[PDB]
Amino acid sequence: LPVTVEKPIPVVYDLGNLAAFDSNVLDKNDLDSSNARREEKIKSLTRDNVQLLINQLLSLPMKTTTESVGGTGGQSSVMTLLQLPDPTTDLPREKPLPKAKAMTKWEKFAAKKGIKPKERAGKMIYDEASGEWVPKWGYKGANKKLDDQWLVEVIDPRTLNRAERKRLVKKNEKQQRRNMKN
Amino acid sequence: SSAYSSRFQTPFRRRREGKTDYYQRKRLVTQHKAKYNTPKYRLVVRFTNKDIICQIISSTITGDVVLAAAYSHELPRYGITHGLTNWAAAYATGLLIARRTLQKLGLDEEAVEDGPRPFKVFLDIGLQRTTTGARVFGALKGASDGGLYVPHSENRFPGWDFETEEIDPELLRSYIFGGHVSQYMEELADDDEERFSELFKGYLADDIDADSLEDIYTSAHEAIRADPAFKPTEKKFTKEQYAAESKKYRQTKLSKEERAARVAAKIAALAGQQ
Amino acid sequence: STLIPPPSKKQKKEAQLPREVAIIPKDLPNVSIKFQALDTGDNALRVPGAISEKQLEELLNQLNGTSVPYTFSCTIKASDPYSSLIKPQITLLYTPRAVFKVKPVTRSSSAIAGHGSTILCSAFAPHTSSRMVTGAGDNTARIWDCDTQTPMHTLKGHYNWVLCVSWSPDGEVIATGSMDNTIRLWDPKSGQCLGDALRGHSKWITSLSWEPIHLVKPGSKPRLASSSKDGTIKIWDTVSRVCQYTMSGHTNSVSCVKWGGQGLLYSGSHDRTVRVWDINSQGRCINILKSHAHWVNHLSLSTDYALRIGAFDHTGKKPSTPEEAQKKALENYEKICKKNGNSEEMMVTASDDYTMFLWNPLKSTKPIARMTGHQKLVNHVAFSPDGRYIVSASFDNSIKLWDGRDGKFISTFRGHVASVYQVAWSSDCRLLVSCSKDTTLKVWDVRTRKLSVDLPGHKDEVYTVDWSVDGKRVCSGGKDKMVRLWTH
Amino acid sequence: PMRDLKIEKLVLNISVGESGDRLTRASKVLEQLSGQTPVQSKARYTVRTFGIRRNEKIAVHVTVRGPKAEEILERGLKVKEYQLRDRNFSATGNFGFGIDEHIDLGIKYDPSIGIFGMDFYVVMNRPGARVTRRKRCKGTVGNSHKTTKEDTVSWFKQKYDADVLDK
Amino acid sequence: NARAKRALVKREAKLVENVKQALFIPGQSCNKNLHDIMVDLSALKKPDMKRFNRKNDIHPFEDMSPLEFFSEKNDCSLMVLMTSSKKRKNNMTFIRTFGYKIYDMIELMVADNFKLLSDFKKLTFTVGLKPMFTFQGAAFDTHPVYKQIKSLFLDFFRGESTDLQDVAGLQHVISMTIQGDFQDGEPLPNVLFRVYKLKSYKSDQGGKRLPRIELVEIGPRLDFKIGRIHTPSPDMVTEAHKKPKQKKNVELDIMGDKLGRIH
RNA sequence: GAGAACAGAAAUCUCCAGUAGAACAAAAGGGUAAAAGCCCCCUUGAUUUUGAUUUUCAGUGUGAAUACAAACCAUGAAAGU
RNA sequence: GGUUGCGGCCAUAUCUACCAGAAAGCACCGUUUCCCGUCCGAUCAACUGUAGUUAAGCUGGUAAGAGCCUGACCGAGUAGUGUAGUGGGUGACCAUACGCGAAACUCAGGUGCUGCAAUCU
């Protein structure tokens, strides 16, 4: 029936952690290990603190919406969610900050020459005779067209083509290791 | 090998038993789970012979609690005494659990701000299959029709089309008012009364027809709607005498003197040269 | 998607700090306050300590010896109703409720299939929140069971579009005014042709109405009225199966008609004119009302809630004797008929001049007030169930809420994107549902004048809407050939 | 009253490792004798001596259960003149054999197909394999209600009256 | 296939981290009491916690290879060792690691009046709810080992973080208070651990706003005796406690509208 | 292991013994099982819109790259993934 | 006390040769027209509680079985190893005082605890 709580020294709060920290004192003779009626003291001490914490939480600003069935984002019109201040508890991280900051022999060249990074528009190209689109890679890429193309007009000449293909592919994948090591 | 009886790891208890899918249960138990803190609830439904079971479940660190529950055999007291496992029996069980819950929590007839907050529940199918037009989803449809709010879809109902996306309500209406059981009744009774005699034996005890059975289901829906009270059976011949009788029929263990006596008799009789 | 600007650095420091523990702590003034009603009453100047609002209800109920709570309003300043002395002798007004609360309409059931055409009109049943009939653009109509969401007694008979549907306030007659210029009565239980159609009109049927229960001799059948583009209003007796007589005041099309409470009829037409008939003089016109600038549409009255429920209450205790039905109608009518203690029912007329008119037909042919403010043609209007408010839906994506007594402005409900088509008050004056030319439907809380829930789900625009009688379901439908029931 | 010897299933198999038309003919004799659609089979690897590859479409069989399964069982047991051996009975209590010239039961010559035969196998049991066949509460059977060889050998030297064939 | 690279992405060092994984490894000495205390603790870290089955002869304050190997191989940052001895009865070794390096270790001793979940009136719970925290005594603002244990328990139990908190999901509360008052030099007091479940009853004196509370125990109830500690290296502290990095006379009002001041 | 006509040492079948000794875009810490293994059905992916990093001569409202988020898109009855 | 549904702790809960189980619960069990899937209604689907029996399935017990589990000065306050003195041997690597802190062997003992709800002569 009584609601308020008083303390000679007022508590401090971490309202994002739903937690409170106390600078008040205990009494050894209220909670001695040899004391039978002992946990009544913890109860009569911490009921006041959870009182003050619910008191600070229900005095918060809140959040409401107007949504409906199948709400894919969040709450609905019936939910009402309090908005908590952010934590001030500085508690450590478990892994350092993931800083992979190098340049790797192309970014430096593109900086020391006026090359701008390209626009990254589409995967597909346009075929002429026929009139399909047939992407340049991703599905039946226009690279692998000399593969099935029947007659070649002057060693089998398509095998050389695949040989050069994999030549450049492996040069790229080699320079990959070169940049990773340096 | 003793090493082969020693080295391996066993599944959990209810996993050695065929009762619980722990994978699906984890997919249930970790709700979202990065957004908010709203407690989850569950609607468990099981289909055996002669029993349809439906319950509302809220888990805990002790392991589980049942908030409400219904069993296919209260339907006599509202007016369903036959076919306690069909699609309409499932509809009735779900409608009963819905109305029971919404009366017991007092909807009609710390969250101090607002408000009604329609009740949320997720259907747990258990080890049951997911086949088009089943009676688990009949109980689901009945539960939702009763007034609960259960997220679900519209392809797992009797009549839905795999050809295109439509759900014919005629076949649903028949499956609610026993049109299937009654069309089967007619297709059997027009020809033979031996299969029709064995089958529908209570229906020859009470002389029921197809239109009358649709009538029974119609009346019984609003009969459930009227008073879903769930008073328990009156408990005749109670628990202490129950346990005394079960104790009488139950076997017991032994004592160390009994075991030493068995060992002595055996190794002195059949071990000393016959 | 556009977002809300995130907070600032200092704005987060204002969040981390404590805030405003409120205790209503001590809290002892020698405070003075005077009670008052709204029409006339003022019943007196004391010095208490504190009190709660529920306790104001209790104290007034004990001072008058009623044993129903009230709503309490102070300092009639936007009229804001230790919770009423914190925003700054106090003037307090007490206003009864007829307390019967229902849950808002939030979720959805599934879209019921059926006829393959654009649904046109809809109507629940007055005596059961489980029965509904709609008339679709197809040459038929349909009745649905709402409790398992399945059709029931697919009804046929008309040979054109079934424009207007109506229910009889007793629960026996479903009248389907068809585009073919006749009507057909229907049996809500079997769906058989009650004889044949009630022919007599020339151009397509538009609207229908019924005599209220408190105006039929106990043991006699109710009568209907029907209007068409012809410009006349034909009376119909349910059992004679012939028209009795016609009233022919207007020249152009008559849009809607309504069978008022004290034995009168009202008809607005496309003649920018509203005309009043007395029926006990064999259907004679008395008052012509020429105050509009463009043709008038959807004339409405005050007590249509009582004129429509038909002695059925918000519980559903079906009638025992015709005399019991008559006494029920009389009580449920006088509940809101003599609000100030004088038998009063008003009329509100909307028209394309972007204005609306308040009318008191017993009093004069002058209007009381003219409400302006809309920017496109006003399409629909409705009085509140308690007769305390008016609302209007226009074609400029807005809704306007009025004072239902002296015709004042209060606020505008905003949020719709295309034109608004029709609204529906709650059963308990609490919420207000609206459907519009966009996909969504919406509901509004009239207390704080804000939107509670918007709810989508359709494939095209919506044409019809209506709440239940008890406040359980709301029915929808339009150009997507699907019915939808919306509940809590 | 329950440890009976019901006839469970008869599998008629033809394993001719050919991806041609002889397999089609085996399937058509399965269609015109058993009726139901014949299910095919493939090859796990290469052997270079049996004439196969991986997924070679080597065999085809049909499983029939019930009254018609009993019918084909009695017809194929009559063709062997009721002469079955003390082997050909799996220690768990099932049997099988083979007869060529499928004019022995059913079809006629009709050289439009050739001639083949149905490698039979009759699987037998007691009633009660549902605990080892169903999904919820899938357990084991008991050595009490586990069927064995010689009891069904007696149930077989019952009607259709086989000869002893080496005890 | 790609499920393998999904794991490496999940084990990447994130801008702001995910939930904390905690591991429970058995020591070389164990009893029913100690194992059951372990399990009544792990009944709170679900469903984000891993446990080993077979025992392990590991010494925390002595060697440091297998502990870092374990914390890596399970991707966990919190390690709880449950071990006993005659020299030390029921010593719980709590371990906080950062980047697979020991951030700190702490020795705790549970008393001989402990309790299991089935010792009190077993009021219902719900699996995986955010707790509430309450800290008593004046020592928790200056005392060094006390700051360590406080931050340890916070980074242990609190799970995750959000910005929207629903109001029904406030069911239980964790109370922690020292063993009376003590002054410097004299040995340390014990710290307690009480896991309640709070309820609400209308007051009629504060309005509909603030109702009264009453607490009940569900288990366990523990007293902890502090022993050996570890302290991390200053450079590792500075590194681990860093801001993730993700303007004058310029402000943002509503509707964006980046404004400015002229002065 | 028992058997099953052609058919052998491996051809194809039916039933138990099965802790992972058969498989993995893993090599260690273990194994997920009614799977992360096999087969089957539905299906895009270089989507678009703004704060952090840097660079443009319309300094050029991000024009674009990139980090992060948020609306979406796929599937599932569903919780979800 | 028996029995069923949702579970926690996940072998003191398992594997093996047998014995037994009143009632109630549940399995076995017949069917193929409706929804549903295959080569095949054995699996899933649907129907009834209709013709039957405990052989099942399930449950308890019986075994010094395998396996497993607990406590203890059971090894062992020690094996080992971190600190202080000229303790020493030239040394392989180890004496003297505080610490930290083990294991196989052996002894006693044991082969499910239960949360939430329904139900039974």
UniProtKB/Swiss-Prot annotation, chain A:
Oligomer status and interactors: Component of a hexameric 5S RNP precursor complex, composed of 5S RNA, RRS1, RPF2, RPL5, RPL11A/RPL11B and SYO1; this complex acts as a precursor for ribosome assembly.
Region (Disordered): 165-182
Keywords on record: Nucleus, Ribosome biogenesis
Taxonomic superkingdom: Eukaryota
Nucleus among keywords: yes
Signal peptide: none
Main location: nucleus
Full protein name: Regulator of ribosome biosynthesis
Curated annotation (Swiss-Prot), chain C:
Gene Ontology CC: one annotated term: nucleolus
Region (Ubiquitin-like (UBL) domain): 28-98
GO BP term, example: protein-RNA complex remodeling
Region of interest (Interaction with MDN1), ranges: 19-101
InterPro entries, A to Z: G-protein_beta_WD-40_rep, NLE, WD40/YVTN_repeat-like_dom_sf, WD40_repeat_CS, WD40_repeat_dom_sf, WD40_rpt
Superkingdom assignment: Eukaryota
WD repeat ranges per the UniProt record: 114-154, 157-196, 200-246, 249-287, 325-369, 373-412, 415-454, 457-488
Alphabetized UniProt keyword annotations: Nucleus, Repeat, Ribosome biogenesis, WD repeat
Family to which this protein belongs: Belongs to the NLE1/RSA4 family.
Name of the protein: Ribosome assembly protein 4
Swiss-Prot record, chain D:
GO annotation, biological process: cytoplasmic translation; ribosomal large subunit assembly; translation
Subcellular location: Cytoplasm; Nucleus
Pfam families: Ribosomal_L5, Ribosomal_L5_C
Molecular function, one GO term: rRNA binding
Function recorded in the entry: Component of the ribosome, a large ribonucleoprotein complex responsible for the synthesis of proteins in the cell. The small ribosomal subunit (SSU) binds messenger RNAs (mRNAs) and translates the encoded message by selecting cognate aminoacyl-transfer RNA (tRNA) molecules. The large subunit (LSU) contains the ribosomal catalytic site termed the peptidyl transferase center (PTC), which catalyzes the formation of peptide bonds, thereby polymerizing the amino acids delivered by tRNAs into a polypeptide chain.
NCBIfam families cross-referenced by the UniProt entry: PRK04219.1 (NF003258)
Family according to the record: Belongs to the universal ribosomal protein uL5 family.
Subunit structure: Component of the large ribosomal subunit (LSU). Mature yeast ribosomes consist of a small (40S) and a large (60S) subunit. The 40S small subunit contains 1 molecule of ribosomal RNA (18S rRNA) and 33 different proteins (encoded by 57 genes). The large 60S subunit contains 3 rRNA molecules (25S, 5.8S and 5S rRNA) and 46 different proteins (encoded by 81 genes). Component of a hexameric 5S RNP precursor complex, composed of 5S RNA, RRS1, RPF2, RPL5, RPL11A/RPL11B and SYO1; this complex acts as a precursor for ribosome assembly.
Swiss-Prot record, chain E:
Cysteines engaged in disulfide bonds, as pairs: none
Keywords: Nucleus, Phosphoprotein
GO biological process: assembly of large subunit precursor of preribosome; maturation of 5.8S rRNA from tricistronic rRNA transcript (SSU-rRNA, 5.8S rRNA, LSU-rRNA); maturation of LSU-rRNA from tricistronic rRNA transcript (SSU-rRNA, 5.8S rRNA, LSU-rRNA); ribosomal large subunit assembly
GO molecular function, one term: 5S rRNA binding
Residue stretches making up the Brix domain: 20-235
GO cellular component: nucleolus; preribosome, large subunit precursor
Localization of this protein: Nucleus, Nucleolus
Function (record text): Required for biogenesis of the 60S ribosomal subunit.
Further comment: Present with 32400 molecules/cell in log phase SD medium.
Name this protein carries in UniProt: Ribosome biogenesis protein RPF2
